[PDB]
Amino acid sequence: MNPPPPETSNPNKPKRQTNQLQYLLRVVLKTLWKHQFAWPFQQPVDAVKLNLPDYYKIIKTPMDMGTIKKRLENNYYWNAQECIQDFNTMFTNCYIYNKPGDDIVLMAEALEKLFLQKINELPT
Numbered sequence: 001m002n003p004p005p006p007e008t009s010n011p012n013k014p015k016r017q018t019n020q021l022q023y024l025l026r027v028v029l030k031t032l033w034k035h036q037f038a039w040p041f042q043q044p045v046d047a048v049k050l051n052l053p054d055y056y057k058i059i060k061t062p063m064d065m066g067t068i069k070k071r072l073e074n075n076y077y078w079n080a081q082e083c084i085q086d087f088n089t090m091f092t093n094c095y096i097y098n099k100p101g102d103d104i105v106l107m108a109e110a111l112e113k114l115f116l117q118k119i120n121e122l123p124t
Protein backbone atom coordinates (compact mmCIF):
# COMPACT_ATOMS: atom_id res chain seq x y z
CA MET A 1 0.00 0.00 0.00
CA ASN A 2 1.14 3.65 0.28
CA PRO A 3 3.90 4.87 2.57
CA PRO A 4 3.17 7.84 4.80
CA PRO A 5 3.81 11.01 2.74
CA PRO A 6 7.16 12.79 3.17
CA GLU A 7 7.63 14.86 6.34
CA THR A 8 6.48 18.47 5.85
CA SER A 9 7.70 19.86 9.16
CA ASN A 10 10.64 19.38 11.48
CA PRO A 11 10.17 20.56 15.05
CA ASN A 12 13.87 20.09 15.72
CA LYS A 13 15.07 22.36 12.91
CA PRO A 14 15.48 26.17 13.18
CA LYS A 15 13.54 28.35 10.73
CA ARG A 16 14.37 31.36 8.58
CA GLN A 17 12.79 33.64 6.01
CA THR A 18 14.94 34.38 2.92
CA ASN A 19 14.41 36.13 -0.41
CA GLN A 20 15.27 32.86 -2.18
CA LEU A 21 12.84 30.75 -0.16
CA GLN A 22 10.02 33.26 -0.61
CA TYR A 23 10.74 33.37 -4.36
CA LEU A 24 10.65 29.56 -4.53
CA LEU A 25 7.15 29.53 -3.05
CA ARG A 26 5.57 32.67 -4.55
CA VAL A 27 7.14 32.52 -8.01
CA VAL A 28 8.63 29.10 -8.78
CA LEU A 29 6.19 26.74 -7.07
CA LYS A 30 3.21 28.98 -7.85
CA THR A 31 3.98 29.10 -11.59
CA LEU A 32 4.49 25.31 -11.84
CA TRP A 33 1.39 24.68 -9.71
CA LYS A 34 -0.80 26.52 -12.21
CA HIS A 35 0.50 24.79 -15.36
CA GLN A 36 -2.03 22.57 -17.17
CA PHE A 37 0.25 19.56 -16.58
CA ALA A 38 0.80 20.11 -12.84
CA TRP A 39 -1.98 17.83 -11.58
CA PRO A 40 -0.12 14.46 -11.51
CA PHE A 41 2.56 16.16 -9.41
CA GLN A 42 0.37 18.07 -6.92
CA GLN A 43 0.15 15.19 -4.39
CA PRO A 44 1.99 11.95 -3.63
CA VAL A 45 1.40 9.08 -6.06
CA ASP A 46 -1.52 7.09 -4.67
CA ALA A 47 -0.38 3.63 -5.75
CA VAL A 48 -3.45 1.96 -4.22
CA LYS A 49 -6.05 4.10 -5.98
CA LEU A 50 -4.06 3.94 -9.24
CA ASN A 51 -3.29 0.25 -8.83
CA LEU A 52 0.49 0.58 -9.20
CA PRO A 53 1.69 -2.15 -6.81
CA ASP A 54 5.33 -1.78 -7.89
CA TYR A 55 5.62 2.02 -7.64
CA TYR A 56 6.94 2.12 -4.07
CA LYS A 57 9.05 -0.96 -4.75
CA ILE A 58 10.92 1.01 -7.44
CA ILE A 59 10.63 4.53 -6.01
CA LYS A 60 12.15 4.63 -2.52
CA THR A 61 12.53 8.43 -2.38
CA PRO A 62 9.13 9.77 -3.40
CA MET A 63 8.55 13.51 -3.81
CA ASP A 64 5.77 15.70 -5.16
CA MET A 65 4.89 19.40 -5.42
CA GLY A 66 2.19 19.15 -2.75
CA THR A 67 4.89 18.12 -0.29
CA ILE A 68 7.27 20.83 -1.55
CA LYS A 69 4.55 23.49 -1.21
CA LYS A 70 3.82 22.45 2.35
CA ARG A 71 7.54 22.33 3.18
CA LEU A 72 7.92 25.93 1.96
CA GLU A 73 4.77 27.08 3.81
CA ASN A 74 6.00 25.36 6.98
CA ASN A 75 9.60 26.75 6.71
CA TYR A 76 10.88 23.21 6.52
CA TYR A 77 13.76 24.29 4.28
CA TRP A 78 16.72 26.20 5.69
CA ASN A 79 18.74 26.18 2.44
CA ALA A 80 17.19 26.91 -0.96
CA GLN A 81 19.20 24.00 -2.38
CA GLU A 82 17.09 21.60 -0.27
CA CYS A 83 14.01 22.73 -2.17
CA ILE A 84 15.70 22.55 -5.56
CA GLN A 85 16.87 19.01 -4.67
CA ASP A 86 13.26 17.98 -3.93
CA PHE A 87 12.15 19.24 -7.37
CA ASN A 88 15.04 17.29 -8.94
CA THR A 89 13.99 14.13 -7.09
CA MET A 90 10.38 14.52 -8.21
CA PHE A 91 11.35 14.78 -11.88
CA THR A 92 13.95 12.03 -11.64
CA ASN A 93 11.43 9.58 -10.10
CA CYS A 94 9.22 10.07 -13.13
CA TYR A 95 12.10 9.17 -15.48
CA ILE A 96 12.95 6.11 -13.37
CA TYR A 97 9.47 4.59 -13.24
CA ASN A 98 8.08 5.51 -16.68
CA LYS A 99 9.05 5.00 -20.36
CA PRO A 100 10.08 7.41 -23.13
CA GLY A 101 6.96 8.92 -24.70
CA ASP A 102 4.59 8.14 -21.79
CA ASP A 103 2.16 11.02 -21.17
CA ILE A 104 3.57 11.52 -17.66
CA VAL A 105 7.13 11.80 -18.97
CA LEU A 106 6.11 14.48 -21.53
CA MET A 107 4.35 16.35 -18.70
CA ALA A 108 7.42 16.17 -16.43
CA GLU A 109 9.60 17.45 -19.27
CA ALA A 110 7.39 20.50 -19.77
CA LEU A 111 7.32 21.26 -16.05
CA GLU A 112 11.06 20.77 -15.71
CA LYS A 113 11.71 23.23 -18.54
CA LEU A 114 9.41 25.77 -16.87
CA PHE A 115 11.21 25.07 -13.56
CA LEU A 116 14.56 25.85 -15.19
CA GLN A 117 13.14 29.10 -16.65
CA LYS A 118 11.91 30.25 -13.20
CA ILE A 119 15.00 29.17 -11.19
CA ASN A 120 17.10 31.08 -13.71
CA GLU A 121 15.79 34.28 -12.13
CA LEU A 122 16.33 33.14 -8.52
CA PRO A 123 17.36 36.26 -6.54
CA THR A 124 20.82 36.61 -5.07
Ligand SMILES: CCN(CC)S(=O)(=O)c1ccc(O)c(NC(=O)c2[nH]c(C)c(C(C)=O)c2C)c1
Pocket: 039, 040, 041, 043, 045, 046, 049, 050, 093, 094, 097, 098, 104
Ligand atom coordinates in the same frame (compact mmCIF):
# COMPACT_ATOMS: atom_id res chain seq x y z
C1 LIG B 1 -7.58 13.25 -11.21
C2 LIG B 1 -7.47 13.02 -9.73
N1 LIG B 1 -6.11 12.60 -9.39
C3 LIG B 1 -5.06 13.60 -9.22
C4 LIG B 1 -5.54 14.65 -8.24
S1 LIG B 1 -5.81 11.11 -9.19
O1 LIG B 1 -7.06 10.41 -9.03
O2 LIG B 1 -5.00 10.91 -8.02
C5 LIG B 1 -5.02 10.48 -10.46
C6 LIG B 1 -5.77 9.88 -11.47
C7 LIG B 1 -5.15 9.32 -12.58
C8 LIG B 1 -3.76 9.35 -12.67
O3 LIG B 1 -3.13 8.79 -13.74
C9 LIG B 1 -2.98 9.94 -11.68
N2 LIG B 1 -1.63 9.92 -11.88
C10 LIG B 1 -0.72 10.53 -11.13
O4 LIG B 1 -1.02 11.37 -10.29
C11 LIG B 1 0.74 10.23 -11.29
N3 LIG B 1 1.70 11.08 -10.92
C12 LIG B 1 2.91 10.57 -11.18
C13 LIG B 1 4.21 11.28 -10.89
C14 LIG B 1 2.71 9.23 -11.79
C15 LIG B 1 3.85 8.34 -12.18
C16 LIG B 1 3.54 6.89 -12.40
O5 LIG B 1 4.99 8.78 -12.28
C17 LIG B 1 1.35 8.99 -11.86
C18 LIG B 1 0.65 7.76 -12.40
C19 LIG B 1 -3.61 10.52 -10.57
